[PDB]
């Protein structure tokens, strides 16, 4: 589930197999790559369900976002983070899952 590339000004990205549960032991990568000057916003939509833990932030499965030297996350749980204004035109999204659990995953739209 790596090398997913999005080059249109707007689009939709999901965890593998969404809206069904994502696969175990996944290390997925997604790239949004736009021309210079564009500034991408990421906004989650629909159900957001990434395995979490009640005491510790995201120790099992997580989504992380990187743009240049900027890093957001990790994120997990039953509620998506607030929309992310990346202020950037080229973004990498990483999604890791461990070897157990049944959770639905995530869906986001991006725009610039």
């Amino acid at each position: 589930c790596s090398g997913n590339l999005f080059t249109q000004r707007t689009g939709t990205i999901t965890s593998p197999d969404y809206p069904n549960p994502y696969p175990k032991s996944s290390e997925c990568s997604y790239t949004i790559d736009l021309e210079e000057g564009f500034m991408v916003t990421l906004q989650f939509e629909d159900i957001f369900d990434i395995e979490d833990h009640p005491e510790v932030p995201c120790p099992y499965d997580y989504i992380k976002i990187k743009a240049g030297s900027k890093v957001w996350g990790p994120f997990c749980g039953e509620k998506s983070p607030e929309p992310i204004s990346t202020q950037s035109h080229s973004i990498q999204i990483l999604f890791r899952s461990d070897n157990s659990g049944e959770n639905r995953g995530w869906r986001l739209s991006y725009r610039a």
Binding site: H53, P54, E55, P59, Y60, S100
Partner: peptide
């Protein structure tokens, strides 16, 4: 009727104890 389906997995384990202190620094 027959017994039901097995129950769901239990809740996750607790956070482990902290690790040991690091090695000493320059003297």
């Amino acid at each position: 009727g027959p017994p039901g389906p097995p129950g769901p997995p239990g809740p996750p384990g607790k956070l482990g104890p902290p690790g040991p202190p690091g090695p000493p620094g320059p003297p």
